[model samples]
Target: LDFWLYKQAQQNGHHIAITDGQESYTYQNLYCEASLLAKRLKAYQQSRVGLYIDNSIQSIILIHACWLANIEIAMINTRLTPNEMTNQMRSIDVQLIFCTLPLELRGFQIVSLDDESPSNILNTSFNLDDIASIMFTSGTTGPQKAVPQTFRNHYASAIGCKESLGFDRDTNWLSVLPIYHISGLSVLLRAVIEGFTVRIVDKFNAEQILTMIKNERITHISLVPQTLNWLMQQGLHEPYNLQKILLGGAKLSATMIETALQYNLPIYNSFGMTETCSQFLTATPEMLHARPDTVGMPSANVDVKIKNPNKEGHGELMIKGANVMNGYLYPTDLTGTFENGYFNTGDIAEIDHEGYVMIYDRRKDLIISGGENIYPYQIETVAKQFPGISDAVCVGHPDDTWGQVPKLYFVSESDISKAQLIAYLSKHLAKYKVPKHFEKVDTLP
Candidate 1:
């Protein structure tokens, strides 16, 4: 159960390490394969590498392998287009990329892992302060920036999580979330640290997840509010082996929480961002049942304080903790973000006398659609690039399916059809980032 020690995990031997459908890997098998991958990756002699792969056993192997090779991984969202992927890699100065799919990035080495063979395990040591991974997150008012997470950050996060939510070796976690996401990636890291089995699914399907819950003995699962809603709508009448449901990403509605409780679903809500590695504020099902709005208290070794509280006691949330990320990859200094050892979370919240933190709003210009963070500035910048578009502003519109999606309003002199605008945005942005609707206007208010 040693954190950041995949080699020692081999002591578990025949214990199941990971299971992807019918394919299963033992702790020994996982370490052996990862060690082999480490050998292959180490040959490049590059410290910074990019992992652009989907959810698979190989993806998990490569993560540990990078750790074994002493390579700092910049985890890429595989859903991104080639252009988006290139921009992220260049921002972090990544020259070598390991991917499951073929990608054409100029001046970068792309190593395909489809035909790689396993070899010996790596014997390496890690410093607590050494950076383990770089995760890209949307800035409140600018383009996406990279958040560097050190070994200490992830290790602390796992320890705090285990203390809050008890788990044992028999615990089976179903990881249907994307490995690129902090919510999903944390599952893999915690599994290794806790020495438990994580069932990995390539995609999210309510039906498949329900079946797994019954068949695979899934004890814990992480999900966004949207996915949890879909699963409930599918008529989850009977409780399965699922012991804990860690919900995050977006606001969990009051009605949804009530519904979950009525159905006897053990849902635990939390509030966190990629900068904090995962959740620093976690609530147990009991706390949630007592007060649905509360996201509970800060985890072990974490501190939270509000800045300039108003009459309602609501203010920007600030956090100081070992779980907090190092800093942005670029713009070396955090500018005014990190002050007096506390990181400004840019979120509005209120904390009660009991230390329960309740978030009222996310960063002002951020829109979370189906758990994906999209900054209005990012969308507006891309929309203004189209021909004949003079100015643009983006806003969030409520939706039943995605919770909220981006809607764009523009000022233009020439006639710009919706089809033309959509086509233009499609080339530069991911399909999800693109505005779902467009409104034409003459002048700004």
Candidate 2:
């Protein structure tokens, strides 16, 4: 009853486990590579190390190697500059880093995976309560906090997802999301738990992903709203072997959901954050077909409630579940996160009597214009209804007359005028709710 990765290797070592478009890997191949890396990882004499690489075959082996070595990992974001990444590692007091690229950190031991050193398999004991990985928050509102996800947290998360969407050995999942993000990392862990195939891609390319769907017969894929929009724009008319398209990361547009269903795509809406280990609420195609905008009910073992409602059952969403992280790692003294056993998620949401969840907006993203409270999602939703508008987001801008006014930033497929947009918004929205200014862009920021 060890973890799934080790058990799978021993049970069915010849099962195909991974593919990177050009190469295939069996469970024995993965176990052998990880065992080699695990021996080298043990020589560093540190319990934690940094993974600063893109999604690759090596990245998978290295991460599995760390797990076998009983070492915790700080999944570093590759999008940050070297200075920013260095500062982050320093803040966490990480002494060892396994990087795909070379770095010049003075006091740290940096190892490269490019070395083809042979290794021997070693038997290692693992505990469910042990820390597995530390993921950092987006830090849009403030400083980034390292959230530690224990083995128990990840195991519960994968189990909850399996209850909703079942998987098997024949399932082929595409790894397009960045490994640094919890959403992407969860796919890796889930495949190991289910003993399935994962197609690894270094980065997302709409053409490459579409080709993989048909060529490799992808069963499941995860996408944010933006990437899903890009895939649809590619004119993918024919269906492949796709079973479910897992969507998360932001509030999905009504238009995107409707259009995806038109092509007979099996789209599932999910809502969660890094602290919750990816997703707590998930809706299958059936649930979405009934309620197009719902993020479904809480997964197994997850408890959710609304606190301080506004008569519509909308309020700050709180979550209590084993999938929730242990706590922040960096500050260590951060408080006020947990109330009674539920973690307060600063998202305004409404849950109908049937238990379907609808997220409105982030509490911090709310704008107050002319003493009137405005949720940007309401304005953005209205803005996206205009012709040629591809996407829209609203942010508050300073206005001496109104204290603060909502400003619209949008992406368009073609020409759109400010007057035409204003006229459209004026018809559907209240006078104060319409954006005061319109700025068109080729793409959204």
Candidate 3:
């Protein structure tokens, strides 16, 4: 299909496809706006453009319009400073930026969204090989590169995610994640492709989310551990008709999982990146209980392998799959990413005999203490489980004794004694892994 939304609108015209708490959009309603906006986008005459927009209903419409116009997108993060945003867009040669407000930047055409006027033209067929979007992600060993996601890659991703997450016309997924991120884009893509309803929240608010769950009858949601923790603290009660919770963006913590299962929350622990389109591995509640550390078996059409393992069976994780991204925007940007067919994900992991995948840590995030490897995620997960600790991070600090010891930076919900904190962490982590010093931070930078 030229546009998934076009196919979905024709198939399910009267069905509610979008809910913004204040307004609801049927498939036809959303498609009409998208088609009208698509005609405007086609007038821009740009092959690829920047979407300097926020997470709102208009952003969703613009996303669909890009597909209809067959224009590649780079959804620039609204949180970034002008210099950062300019440098990023410039790196990929994005000259025309469609933003919500009139903001001027040098050497670029900043087109502000004013209206959604009607036009007749609509795309009826699509080329799968055409680039659909461009995203920036940090390289494992080098500078950042703009990753290009093709139409084929996105559709393949939607199909693979459907195998893991199951979709239906009645499915109402709540999206609080930023549209600039891959997670947010995947949710929109999946919903439109499968003809499901998407409930969007422009900002993350725990109480508002809980309210929507009860009043709007949201069937599914995607969250990180911190957001889920906030909802739990805000008293999310049971029997709200929420069927599933897709969790990722950080390492899966045991405390989060235990409490989630305790509340009878259907949680799926996942691991993925922008290059993969979305999670390639997901662990159901059953798989989580069987192997707490595992990210679970690979989804359908995904081939995972560990590269050059040590005696203990740890190596960089590699993925070869239908959903894997084609390449960066520039051929020069391509590093040692592909070998055979697998993309080299610079994450250290292990594959067990039962085919469970466990990511120990990213290479850049690893800490070495006393000639032994220490994973910060392992420490942070244990520390976050401690009472009064709202958030925690472990980093390497100078120490002549052990060469390096973990230093803790945390955000606490209440006063916690240093002695008590150390004692509690010692109970869970090895003595060397326990942090030698602590710094209370308002939030992570």
Candidate 4:
């Protein structure tokens, strides 16, 4: 796709293309440089190459290089421990690990192409179905699951989102999320498809975010509800160029959305997984302002339905679409394990009459207490309202009377008693939804 895109750009005589942060490359320079990198990678072996670097223009170009050579890219998370990352490499059948900066990827030959500049080498007639990305799941359930994201899948995701979210040539996506995650990777794809600018951030903090939006004229941003909830706690409502915030990963409380709206910040809720490329359903800023809980209508070329739904709306989400992944990659075997095209999303959701999807629970994390199901993340939202609460995680424990009861681990800046916190939850949450136990901690995982 990189070669094809470059060839098209060259044929059309397009001067400007993309850049990470350091330099802007023309259509000509991008193709040539990527070709040289492709040759270097081919010299190593025909095995998967791990991209263990932060998101940058050079990082972007290297992805193109991998595509040009038909070599797979194992996008390793920089946050992973050495052992953890090594385990990841072993699973993916990695032959080479590419590093860019002072950050080292141990036990692999490092290719340093940062100092070299090559001329134009365009090749336009690339196949859309070529292997592009090997996305690993968030491992929120267990160990990460590797999913193959083809060129077709990535392209479909970009197009589907564009049709759903109304992203245009002028839209600028603020990439506060990590590039390693499918969320950030999709943002880059969206920029390419929509001919828009992606403002990159190496890290995320509320104050710095506000400053970036104001200065860079950012129009859109994507985040998880946890991140949004953190930003709301900062209590800064100063206006900026940001038009919308797309929230996903986990379900957010109504109160969190209401709080954000109070400051005139619109939230666009979305439902996505690494397996589905990026998003299947996404609410625009307009729809989100009207309904905070809904993840909005489904995107084009995407089919979303409940798997074994109790009713017409509630069940495990099963997504079938062009953007959906091929299957999981097995490390020990170096093979694909998926039997069918449908990747079963373990997320339980409720689809309303209008086709808007509302994620209700993670099957693994669902807690049944006193014959009532309790979503821990749901309770954590209200629990976070307590003063001095920095982070909160809810877990289910065995109980004699209730069979099982909800327990919370809360991190606070200062000490706060259980009695005091329960009093706070009692005011905000339903009686049964409140936690039965609380553990105060100075920090949280």
- How high is the CA lDDT of each candidate model? 0.81, 0.81, 0.81, 0.71
- In terms of lDDT, the poorest run of 10 residues in model 3 is 115-124
RMSD of each: 9.8, 12.7, 13.2, 13.4
Tens digit of per-residue lDDT, candidate 3, span 1-445: 3467777777788988888888888989999998888888888789889988777788888888887887899978776678877888888888999986457788898888874122236543577888888887753333456888887888888888778867677889999998888899888888988889999898999998888888888998999989988998887756378888898877677777788888888888899988888899989988887787778888778899998787788888999987898876752524456879889887889998889899986654557778877666677778888888887767788899888877889998688789988999899988877888998887642
Q: Mind sharing the TM-score for model 4?
A: 0.72
lDDT of model 4 at position 219: 81
Q: Which pairs of residues collide in candidate 4?
A: 20-57, 91-331
Q: Which whole-number lDDT from 0 to 100 does residue 343 have in model 2?
A: 89
State the TM-score for model 1.
Answer: 0.79
Across 128-198, the per-residue lDDT of candidate 2 in tens digits comes to 89999988876444346788999889989998998876667788999899988888899988888888889
lDDT of 4 by residue, 35-79 (tens): 777777667766477887676777777877777667778888887
Q: TM-score for every candidate vs. truth?
A: 0.79, 0.79, 0.79, 0.72
Model 4 stretches astray by more than 4 angstroms = 1-4, 11-29, 103-107, 112-125, 226-240, 311-313, 331-341, 365-445
Model 1 lDDT per residue over 1-445, tens place: 1334454454576788899988999888888777777878888889999988888998889888888778999988876777777888898899899987667678788888853122224445656788989998754455577899998898889888887766777889888888888888888888887788989999988988888877878899889889998888776655588888998877777788888888888889988788998999888877887788888888768999998787788887999998998778863433556869899887788998788999887555678889888767666777878999988768788999999988898999999989988988999888888988888887532
TM-score winner between candidates 3 and 4? 3
Assess candidate 4 and give its lDDT.
0.71
Q: Pairs clashing in candidate 2?
A: none
